Amino acid sequence: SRVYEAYPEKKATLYFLVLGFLALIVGSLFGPFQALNYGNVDAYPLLKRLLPFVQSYYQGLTLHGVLNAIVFTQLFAQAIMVYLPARELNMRPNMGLMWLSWWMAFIGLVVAALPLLANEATVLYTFYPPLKGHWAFYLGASVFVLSTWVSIYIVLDLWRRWKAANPGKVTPLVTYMAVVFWLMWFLASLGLVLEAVLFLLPWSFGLVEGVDPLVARTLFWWTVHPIVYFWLLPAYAIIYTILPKQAGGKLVSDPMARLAFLLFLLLSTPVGFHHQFADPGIDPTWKMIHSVLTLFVAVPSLMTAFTVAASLEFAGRLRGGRGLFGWIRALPWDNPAFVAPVLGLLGFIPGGAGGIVNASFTLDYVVHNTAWVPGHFHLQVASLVTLTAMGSLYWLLPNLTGKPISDAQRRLGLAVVWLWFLGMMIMAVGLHWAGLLNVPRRAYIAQVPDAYPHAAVPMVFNVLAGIVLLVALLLFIYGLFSVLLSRERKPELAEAPLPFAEVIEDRRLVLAMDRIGFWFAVAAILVVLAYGPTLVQLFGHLNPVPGWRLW
Amino acid sequence: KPKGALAVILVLTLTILVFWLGVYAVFFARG
Amino acid sequence: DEHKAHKAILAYEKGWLAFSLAMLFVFIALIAYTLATHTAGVIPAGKLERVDPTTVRQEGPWADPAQAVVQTGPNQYTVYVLAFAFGYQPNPIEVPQGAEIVFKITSPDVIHGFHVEGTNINVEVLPGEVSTVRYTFKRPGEYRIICNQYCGLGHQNMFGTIVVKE
Ligand code: HAS
Ligand code: HEM
Ligand SMILES: CCCCCCCC/C=C/CCCCCCCC(=O)OC[C@H](O)CO
Ligand SMILES: CCCCCCCC/C=C\CCCCCCCC(=O)OC[C@H](O)CO
Ligand SMILES: CCCCCCCC/C=C\CCCCCCCC(=O)OC[C@H](O)CO
Numbered sequence: 001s002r003v004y005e006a007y008p009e010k011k012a013t014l015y016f017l018v019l020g021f022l023a024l025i026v027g028s029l030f031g032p033f034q035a036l037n038y039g040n041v042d043a044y045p046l047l048k049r050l051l052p053f054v055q056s057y058y059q060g061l062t063l064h065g066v067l068n069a070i071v072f073t074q075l076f077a078q079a080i081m082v083y084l085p086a087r088e089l090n091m092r093p094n095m096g097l098m099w100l101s102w103w104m105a106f107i108g109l110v111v112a113a114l115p116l117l118a119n120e121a122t123v124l125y126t127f128y129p130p131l132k133g134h135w136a137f138y139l140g141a142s143v144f145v146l147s148t149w150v151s152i153y154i155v156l157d158l159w160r161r162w163k164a165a166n167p168g169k170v171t172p173l174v175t176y177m178a179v180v181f182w183l184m185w186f187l188a189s190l191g192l193v194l195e196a197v198l199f200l201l202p203w204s205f206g207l208v209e210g211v212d213p214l215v216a217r218t219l220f221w222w223t224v225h226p227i228v229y230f231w232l233l234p235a236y237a238i239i240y241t242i243l244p245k246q247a248g249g250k251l252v253s254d255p256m257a258r259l260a261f262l263l264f265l266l267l268s269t270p271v272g273f274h275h276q277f278a279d280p281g282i283d284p285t286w287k288m289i290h291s292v293l294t295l296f297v298a299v300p301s302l303m304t305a306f307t308v309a310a311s312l313e314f315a316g317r318l319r320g321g322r323g324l325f326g327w328i329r330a331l332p333w334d335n336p337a338f339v340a341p342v343l344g345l346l347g348f349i350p351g352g353a354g355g356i357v358n359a360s361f362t363l364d365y366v367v368h369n370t371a372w373v374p375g376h377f378h379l380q381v382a383s384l385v386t387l388t389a390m391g392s393l394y395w396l397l398p399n400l401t402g403k404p405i406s407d408a409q410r411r412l413g414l415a416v417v418w419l420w421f422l423g424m425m426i427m428a429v430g431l432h433w434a435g436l437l438n439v440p441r442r443a444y445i446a447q448v449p450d451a452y453p454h455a456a457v458p459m460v461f462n463v464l465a466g467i468v469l470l471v472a473l474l475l476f477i478y479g480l481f482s483v484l485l486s487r488e489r490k491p492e493l494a495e496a497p498l499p500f501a502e503v504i505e506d507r508r509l510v511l512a513m514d515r516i517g518f519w520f521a522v523a524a525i526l527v528v529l530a531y532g533p534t535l536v537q538l539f540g541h542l543n544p545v546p547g548w549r550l551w
Numbered sequence: 552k553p554k555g556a557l558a559v560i561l562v563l564t565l566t567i568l569v570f571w572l573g574v575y576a577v578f579f580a581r582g
Numbered sequence: 583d584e585h586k587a588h589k590a591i592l593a594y595e596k597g598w599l600a601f602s603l604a605m606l607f608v609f610i611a612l613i614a615y616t617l618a619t620h621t622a623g624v625i626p627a628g629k630l631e632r633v634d635p636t637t638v639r640q641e642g643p644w645a646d647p648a649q650a651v652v653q654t655g656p657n658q659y660t661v662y663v664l665a666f667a668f669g670y671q672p673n674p675i676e677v678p679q680g681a682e683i684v685f686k687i688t689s690p691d692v693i694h695g696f697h698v699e700g701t702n703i704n705v706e707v708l709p710g711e712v713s714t715v716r717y718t719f720k721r722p723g724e725y726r727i728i729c730n731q732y733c734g735l736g737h738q739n740m741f742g743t744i745v746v747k748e
């Protein structure tokens with residue numbers, strides 16, 4: 001194929017995409033089981049006959065989160081947030097680096113997967129000390145994530161190269177998102193890299209006897225809030241700069257898109273305590289600060305809601321829709337690439353709503369570590385992000401492989417997308433409600449079937465969700481494999497342009513927002529100011545404690 | 552006027568508000 | 583028309599950005615309120631209070647569970663709780679209703695949840711550190727403690743009891 005000779009980025013992107021879905025499928029296999037568990041139905045015996053290496057509920061839970069929320073989400077981000085900026089500027093990504101990063105990812109994953117599958121790392125995707133996993137888990141995880149540092153460099157390169165060719169022109173939209181995105185991720189990632197290097201790796205290696213739980217946790221959450229925005233923004237980039245076209249309309253504001261993204265660079269990292277509201281040894285004043293700063297990080301998505309909604313109504317009116325609801329039925333509901341993100345956006349309403357509760361200091365005490373939290377995050381990542389990623393099969397895959405999407409396959413796509421959406425709404429109800437009834441998260445509750453009698457109603461939703469999603473999953477596997485392993489190739493698809501939207505004015509803001517070095521340091525100050533004082537007191541009073549293996 | 556978008560942000564508002572006022576009520580009941 | 587729809591969208595978006603900001607501020611105000619009331623008692627003490635997990639069952643306040651309840655004021659008791667794989671000591675925790683209860687909770691092994699069903703008590707317990715929270719039980723009877731932090735294979739069955747005397 002001469003298409004790859006000239007556009008080799010298509011192949012590397014494809015690789016990132018395929019590995020990502022492979023991880024999604026394998027990770028998700030465990031979900032229905034878990035769903036049935038939260039419905040007080042124990043189907044683990046069956047799962048263990050099918051996959052004999054699985055020793056417990058918790059090993060499946062470790063696989064599910066790592067594979068789904070770390071691996072797939074990261075691979076997606078890497079695919080989107082390199083390929084898209086590259087196509088907009090019409091430039092070649094540094095291919096040497098592009099393959100290095102893929103191999104880093106692949107190898108790290110391979111390495112983490114070994115102790116994971118062998119039952120040697122059944123911590124969770126949070127691997128809190130002193131629960132102590134196999135060194136291979138920490139190493140392979142570490143290497144996997146560091147892959148993104150190469151991605152950061154790659155996009156930074158493209159960006160500067162373009163800027164050299166074009167001094168005193170503002171950054172093109174998609175590329176601006178990608179640049180603020182990857183820089184945000186660089187700040188964000190220093191928490192975990194720090195944790196892994198100073199603590200986790202030495203510890204798993206036999207180098208230090210103990211780790212300090214609270215410092216470990218504090219560093220961990222430095223990263224693992226912004227990581228969610230890292231998951232979210234590849235989806236948004238699509239929702240902003242592609243979806244408007246797929247809908248039949250335009251993006252209603254370039255500046256608004258830039259500003260949302262700007263706010264994410266500034267506000268995505270200095271918030272982590274909102275995961276530590278119930279931790280000892282952190283001053284309550286610093287919790288209140290992080291609380292307020294968290295409410296602030298809701299702003300860009302609040303803004304997003306309006307910008308995007310308006311973009312939808314706009315396309316809806318352009319297609320004939322009249323009334324207050326007319327524009328809705330006017331939109332291309334026969335297109336899976338249109339439907340998946342929009343359905344994901346609907347769920348984001350209750351999703352963000354629950355987030356906002358979570359953020360409010362004392363209110364967190366109601367919901368912390370109950371089923372509510374999974375309820376919240378399935379709506380955010382397992383629905384919005386995953387569904388956006390799903391719908392791109394129907395535009396991105398043909399773009400990358402030149403392989404066509406039959407009408408049959410378009411139909412099955414609508415089904416998968418819808419069943420997946422509903423199943424997630426259904427489970428979202430069961431989880432939030434069960435959460436409100438004090439049902440703990442991360443628990444093989446079906447194995448204590450008398451513990452939670454009050455939860456009987458939400459439980460039925462969890463079962464229903466379980467089966468509905470098993471179906472969606474099954475259909476998703478069969479659909480992806482029909483479209484990857486299909487017969488035909490029409491390279492004219494692989495050569496088509498991506499469906500970027502046009503924009504339908506405030507140059508002065510735009511110029512300001514383009515002073516990227518400046519905003520980057522503002523971000524970095526905000527992190528020092530938000531985390532410095534606490535981390536300083538913490539490092540000065542370390543109390544390492546021995547590791548445990550309790551599985 | 553973007554009446555459709557306004558509907559949406561209205562739904563989003565009421566959702567937040569039912570969620571937030573709800574759990575606030577619950578916090579005080581459990582306080 | 584396209585010119586006009588852009589004007590209107592931007593105008594209204596601005597309205598909504600002010601309103602959503604307002605709403606966000608009002609929550610901040612309502613959160614602060616909670617911080618000024620007795621309900622704030624469940625917020626951990628921010629103080630670092632380091633202990634040794636390996637000897638905490640041998641010496642110190644967690645070593646004799648039957649003496650874990652100590653009157654620290656005219657209407658105040660401190661309770662020294664150990665959350666461990668997989669349960670709580672003492673069991674049951676016995677306290678009087680309407681007295682202010684300072685819980686000082688620690689673990690000798692791994693992290694555990696301390697979530698008192700029916701209350702706002704919900705605190706992570708970390709080995710090496712003492713988690714200190716305050717609550718005043720209004721109603722007598724039996725309240726169950728749930729561990730809601732994954733702590734290993736015994737996690738799903740890790741429960742404790744508090745009994746509030748009339
Ligand atoms: C991609 C993944 C996720 C996103 C995004 C995310 C959003 C937020 N989160 Fe979160 N969450 C928390 C706060 C929030 C807040 C304030 C936001 C906000 O950024 C959300 C703002 C968004 C909105 C305000 C919604 C706007 C709505 C939109 C954009 C849709 C409009 C629809 C349209 C336009 C469609 C209309 C079209 C038609 C056709 C009608 C807190 C604490 O403050 C915790 C800890 C809780 C605890 O006790 O552990 C937490 C923990 C989690 C965890 C679990 C961590 C763990 O395992 O321990 C994960 C995985 C997660 C993921 C995600 N989270 N969250
Ligand atoms: C077939 C769909 C899936 C089902 C039915 C499902 C259901 C579940 C259930 C019931 C839980 C709670 C388990 C517990 O607290 O014990 C869970 C947790 C989780 N899910 Fe999923 N899920 C699926 C897909 C996804 C996807 C696509 C993602 C990521 C994109 C995801 C990420 C997570 C994470 C972060 C965990 C938390 C693990 C932990 O607490 O350590 N879910 N899922
Ligand atoms: C096409 C994809 C969507 C499919 C959606 C199908 C919904 C689930 C079945 C409904 C029929 C009613 C079945 C109920 C009868 C059996 C219930 C039962 O026996 O209860 C379980 C038992 O308590 C535990 O072991
Ligand atoms: C317990 C909760 C479970 C219940 C879950 C329900 C959640 C919301 C479902 C659908 C809303 C979607 C509204 C928009 C639907 C658009 C389809 C449409 O209008 O179709 C046009 C027609 O086909 C000509 O093209
Ligand atoms: C775009 C999709 C739309 C998203 C919008 C969906 C948000 C749903 C909001 C509230 C549901 C909760 C029901 C209302 C609260 C009932 C409270 C109740 O039943 O009280 C508890 C009582 O103590 C126990 O017996």
Ligand SMILES: CCCCCCCC/C=C\CCCCCCCC(=O)OC[C@H](O)CO
Nearest residue numbers: 039040041456457459460461463464465467
């Ligand atoms: C066309 C396909 C549409 C079908 C979609 C279903 C409609 C939603 C309602 C019920 C199904 C729920 C099935 C739940 C499975 C059994 C529930 C269960 O496990 O019951 C426990 C009981 O409450 C204590 O003993």
Ligand SMILES: CCCCCCCC/C=C\CCCCCCCC(=O)OC[C@H](O)CO
Nearest residue numbers: 350425428429432569570573574576577580
């Ligand atoms: C689209 C699917 C998304 C799923 C969305 C999940 C539904 C949760 C909704 C609202 C929670 C509001 C809190 C409800 C609590 C109300 C109880 C109440 O009224 O509180 C006073 C009482 O005294 C206390 O015990």
Ligand SMILES: CCCCCCCC/C=C\CCCCCCCC(=O)OC[C@H](O)CO
Nearest residue numbers: 557560561564565593594595596597598601
């Ligand atoms: C207790 C609180 C009750 C909450 C109940 C829901 C309130 C509705 C929410 C948001 C509307 C935001 C839209 C802002 C409209 C502002 C007006 C505007 O932007 O007007 C410009 C136009 O040019 C003029 O001629």
Ligand SMILES: CCCCCCCC/C=C\CCCCCCCC(=O)OC[C@H](O)CO
Nearest residue numbers: 575579582608609611612615616619620621
């Ligand atoms: C445009 C008009 C401008 C006006 C807009 C102002 C917004 C007002 C909203 C909330 C105020 C907060 C009131 C604080 C009262 C909370 C007390 C409470 O709820 O107390 C429960 C409990 O029983 C005690 O311990």
Ligand SMILES: CCCCCCCC/C=C\CCCCCCCC(=O)OC[C@H](O)CO
Nearest residue numbers: 433436437577580581699700722723724725
């Ligand atoms: C669609 C979404 C629907 C969501 C449905 C919402 C249901 C939540 C209800 C109540 C939570 C409030 C708990 C109130 C605390 C009182 C419990 C209590 O007093 O029980 C233990 C005590 O020990 C005995 O002596």
Ligand code: CUA
Nearest residue numbers: 694729733737
């Ligand atoms: Cu102790 Cu879970």
Ligand SMILES: [Cu+2]
Nearest residue numbers: 224225274275
């Ligand atoms: Cu967070």
